[PDB]
Design a protein around this ligand. Sequence first.
Ligand SMILES: Nc1ncnc2c1ncn2[C@@H]1O[C@H](COP(=O)(O)OP(=O)(O)O)[C@@H](O)[C@H]1O
Ligand SMILES: [Mg+2]
Lengths: 287, 379
Amino acid sequence: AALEKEIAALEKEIAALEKEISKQEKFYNDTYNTVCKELLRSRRLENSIIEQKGTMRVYAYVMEQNLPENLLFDYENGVITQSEHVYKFNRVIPHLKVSEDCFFTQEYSVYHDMALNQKKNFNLISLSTTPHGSLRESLIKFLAEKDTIYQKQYVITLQFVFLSDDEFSQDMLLDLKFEKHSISLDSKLVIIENGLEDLPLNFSADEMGIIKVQFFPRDPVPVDFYFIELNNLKSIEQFDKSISAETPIALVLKKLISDTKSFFLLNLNDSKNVNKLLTISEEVQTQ
Amino acid sequence: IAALKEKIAALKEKIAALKEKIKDTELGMKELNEILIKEETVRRTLHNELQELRGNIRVYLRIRPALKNLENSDTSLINVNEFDDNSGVQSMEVTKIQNTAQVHEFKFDKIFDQQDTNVDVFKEVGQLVQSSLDGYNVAIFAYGQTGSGKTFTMLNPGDGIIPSTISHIFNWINKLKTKGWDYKVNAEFIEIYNENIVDLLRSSIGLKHEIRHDQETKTTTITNVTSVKLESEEMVEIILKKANRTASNEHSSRSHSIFIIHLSGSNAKTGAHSYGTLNLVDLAGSERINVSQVVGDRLRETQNINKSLSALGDVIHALGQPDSTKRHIPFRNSKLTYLLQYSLTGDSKTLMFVNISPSSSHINETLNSLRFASKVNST
Ligand SMILES: Nc1ncnc2c1ncn2[C@@H]1O[C@H](COP(=O)(O)OP(=O)(O)O)[C@@H](O)[C@H]1O
Ligand SMILES: [Mg+2]
């Protein structure tokens, strides 16, 4: 039984290699976790710097699968270069290295925790030229899944509506008054306890939309979060609006930009309409 | 049997698959570690930017708890306002109630009140210790009348600024080891009394201790002063105790004590080096002494202390002005400011702690300390 003896010798070598792998995994996991923690240490400093300077938050989220070679991305310095034009950002985020779930935990959570802890009403304004719902999907998972820290100390509520020009406008959950310094809505009010399960099947679909999220502290005044999406070229064109009109779309935009903490995100996807997104990000910071 | 022959092939294939997994994981870890090493450099840059924005010169007021029954229990003369998040300033007032109320208003970067502990204080100081580790010079001063809490703030066992600083230093050095950084920590502990330097780490009378500046490296040495390598928290605790603050504490209250820590870092993986000096100063009591019926030695001691403290105020005031490079700053006038000059200029960070009593018993001296605090405020 020479072949059976060789199997024993090969099984012994597999056992020795697998033991080495198991040990290696422990070290790898420690280093991997440290990297994630250290990156967040940087983001906390970055956030503290933004607060000191009082500048507006404008971030870029880059999918470089089908984009022109002319457009160059500096993920370390927050710069997009065309042509000698340089577009400045707080951070330029690579989609290849950072997923939608990772965006919220690594790149967004510092901002989120800050605004929520100092009871400041805040928002996330996401701009894109291609409709994609995996970002909105990740937001809900991050905020209102069963086991999140936000579900632990807050009761979480959601309202999802879509405003169109002009003028209506419908509820996105089925089938507005401006009080003090927050936007109240007369729509369907849904309490989330288990994440996307409490929302309809058409919620994360299609991979101006407004999501209003309220945070009621457990043991009186609810903290408001607003999630704005512009899906395509036409939607972002209305966002420009001579820095012209009084459409309900612009009426809530002006309210949030002046009365709440803003977070601007540019989702660069298609190669056809990159330049228009880049121009408006420059227009947001200067105005 | 072909079944066994096919089994061997699958095992030999699995061997090559597992060996490649090991090699890939080694490569991944190598890449993760380069991110860690790079991120430490990024952190230093970001941290310093934040420190600049928060001010290279900062003034903190600290009101210690009232002491029964060594002073009046009445603390009503002082009102502390909330920290203004918008302006980054925290204000307070001293009021004497009469027909026309005597009001004095003062503004600080932060005010610590009776309930604020040494742990609370260090939440703010830790970032400056970090600057020193990152390769910047830092000077932290405790100012105020004898009895106001300068020594407690600096040296209370476990949680004083100095013990908290040592802990931060060694914990951070330990963390940095895994990122290619090697650190050498050396310290001096000196006293300035009547413009003379005494070595508090000596292990005697006729010894000369003179300030020597090296303009090229912007470093300073004192002749014949003991320098000790700091190896652990426990080792420093032993060294601190031996050097320590009735005759002894009277002398200590009439002199400046300065703990000087040099943090020398080198990274063999990146070729980076960093060198920062941290200066922790427990100043001579600022109280105004009635010198009328006093003896000559006491008079001159009072004059020197006033001269030294006034020069420190003059120097820091000047450094906080927009026209700092244009105007002349005379460090040379006083031994304390001359000694510390390289830790007060350039990218250096300065923190002035002004300690006060909350008691009505000390209101006049408190107002002096608050006026000194207003002078050292930057623009
Ligand atoms: N923050 C504080 N908390 C509690 N006790 C304090 C505090 N600061 C000072 N003390 C006490 O007040 C007294 C005088 O403090 P000390 O540090 O000797 O003042 P100084 O060094 O300014 O003369 C001491 O008994 C000290 O324990
Ligand atoms: Mg003392």
